[model samples]
Target: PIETVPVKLKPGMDGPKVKQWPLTEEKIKALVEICTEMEKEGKISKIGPENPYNTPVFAIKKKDSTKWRKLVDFRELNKRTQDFWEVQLGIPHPAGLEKKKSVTVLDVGDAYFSVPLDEDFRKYTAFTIPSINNETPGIRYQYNVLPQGWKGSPAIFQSSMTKILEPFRKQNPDIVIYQYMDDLYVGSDLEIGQHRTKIEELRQHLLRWGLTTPDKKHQKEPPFLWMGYELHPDKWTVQPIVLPEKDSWTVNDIQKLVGKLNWASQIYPGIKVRQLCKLLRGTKALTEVIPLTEEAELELAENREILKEPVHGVYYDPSKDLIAEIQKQGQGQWTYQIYQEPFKNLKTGKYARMRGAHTNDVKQLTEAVQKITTESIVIWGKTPKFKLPIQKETWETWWTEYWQATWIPEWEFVNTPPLVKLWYQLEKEPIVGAETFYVDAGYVTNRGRQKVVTLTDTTNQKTELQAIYLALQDSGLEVNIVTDSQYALGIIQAQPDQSESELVNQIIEQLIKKEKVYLAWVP
Candidate 1:
């Protein structure tokens, strides 16, 4: 498919090094590796030194704000090229999975590189890669596919995706997709065996497009993790993102900690808001218990978050035809998510609600959630007037009669604590100990290997968390964890038992069920 059309470069092949970004051996080598692969796959080709164009290249941090991957800064290039208007993303929530079934994440590693670029655009992509050996100055190459960081790359790829998987969604009947570039979230209202089957079937669909998946981990099963969040039938939440504690705190540490707290600030309606104001300048000591301000109080705001539950509402599939057995006087225009006023039509305002369409193949596990589908519509003049030519009289009949008369039941979403995904798995063994073990986490060499893998980025907080997990699992006694790391004392995440994949919040979930565990900050 990449051979169908090639990257087209403009006339003047002048890519004088713009002298940008941190160009290091680690960076260049990684760039070379991916570029070489792109060349071999016919997605790119070695460019001649004649008319070379080099945009500054850089490493992009992954979704977690951690881990780096190579990327090209195609700013000047994009300035000269054609661009897609926009990338389309919709609810595509497929609610059944949230309620009665299951969901899993399938990632298309390096998804953007798979997109094809117009053959005419290849020359603009030419960049000089500094030579690894002492031999040459730099190697030049250009891409055939829409490479990452191109301003238009996301739009091009997202457009391709909707049509790419259409056939697969049509065949699998059990699958429902909510995709963003290559991160496809497929869900089913079926039980585990049935869900796993659908996931396995999805592989061939990806392969048909010349796309491959991550090694075996995702290629195998569910409990799907993606975009730094976990999705599960029973529960789900954001992953525990961590950074090592600073030595003697500085402005950098204060700012970073405050940034994370900002999310909680919006969600937690307390402390008269980030009344986190000057909470820093006022600290009695560098090691002061982050008084969180001139702010209302840290503890209360955090407590507010645990009391609130995230909104998980009905998400309709965009692929859906907005189907229903209907008469010709069908609804006029469709305006979605306009919950407020200046509503174009109170007259033709007819609501289309879901009745049923279980064409989806996965058999429902229970009768309560039989995979019903629904939608509501009204003529919102979001577009022009022609789109909303509903007959006035007919709209009148629908409005006051059916619209006002429909008896909707009172529905309120229940509240729950935000999940912390830290979980550590414990081996199945007898609970034998009576003595409480106090655990603290700090950097440590691998006991078995006698060497530590980490060169830097080690922290006592991690050790403190691990200590709690080890103590709880090794003997399940009245496990108590004590730590002096200021970061650990205030950090949230990690739990009592189960999984390297298990997050801190999940660990706390397990710990909550037992009276045997306790944590105290050793200031």
Candidate 2:
């Protein structure tokens, strides 16, 4: 309970001035006349007699005699009795309601320098001495210097620290930064990478601004203290250290302390206040000998009750029900049905060999041909051509066999164009529209100078070439192929003397005939 002080108003005190009492007969008569006029105009209520002897009865007519009344002054009675009036400051509770495990408090310990209050001491320079008087050293006059306690001290310190640490905050955009006075608490997603760089950067910035942080007082590890409570990365609890420890304590003391501390601790795993109490009491050996309080017995009973209670909240039972529900929802059935059926009027040969299958098989023969063709171009700089007596007939037969055995067996018509892409194009694009594609391709020069390169691949490129090609062919649009490398352009430029180079002439004719297809490109 807080103590209250009384304030008394004296005659000479600085306050509102009021008119003095006591008046002459003529002045009294003038005041009565003015009051009468005021009452007639409804500006004042009629005054009544406090003492019956002091003109209690004036002019009471017989018909309105019952309406006449006497009034009494209660000012004296009011003055004698003590009246209580509560004046609330409207300040909120300093601490929040949430339970916390620890609290991180910051104090501006070195914010000011205090100087001794002494006049002669002020001139005590190096190699210079002031003559000392007979006055005692402790009793000598000295000026105690320090920053004055002002209303804006906290605000000023907070603003200064915030400005100094702004760069670190901008760098780590995902972290939550809280400031009170000169203290700062940063909360980030616990699963993210280490915070060593962030902590060091903040400390260095503060030091540059002439603010010093005590190494022992600073906390970087979890189960950290913040705002009068201990906050875990995933949980919170009231700080137990704040609770009072005494030489002799009662049940109420234990209960109140435990209750207060447990407010924040309950959210964490394996935190039971009752268990903590049991451990502190250490009654394991004396359980049969010592007497247990009613509250302790009740708490024990409650713990047992919690263990036996049925699980009531949201629960995920994966084994019997969830799996069956997922299967019933047709997760894998479409792919199974599509692959089992014949494709393009051709029955897929099950024993066909492909690149991924055994050697000496039909699929492997076709893969080998494709591989040899590619390798010939890459390694030998020449395209391999197959020559046989009946080459056309053999080629056609090989293509048909290859399509049925390799293409049909590997193709998944149902799953090729993923459902997610279709959903994105038809639904998501209409709602959210396309976003700009940005790539931060960092590169290092031969001299090891690192630089960031900004490359723009627009939405159209992603949606049309990339998305469409992946949907239809189940492969990406290779950049090297789309932008033709050497042969076509080289031939066109080399034969400029001719009517037109073969490739350029063909392209011009196609354009003139309105048969050329142009791909959209955007920077």
The Cα local distance difference test for each model comes to 0.46, 0.31
In candidate 1, what are the lDDT values of residues 47-146, reduced to their tens digit? 7768545777765557875345766777777666554566764442222223337766667865777777776667677766686576766777777787
Give the per-residue lDDT digits (tens) of candidate 2, residues 274-298: 4336534644342223334566555
Using lDDT as the measure, the top candidate is 1
Report, for all candidates in order, the number of backbone clashes: 36, 21
Worst 10 residues of 1 by lDDT: 359-368
Query: What is the Cα-based lDDT of residue 214 in candidate 1?
Result: 55
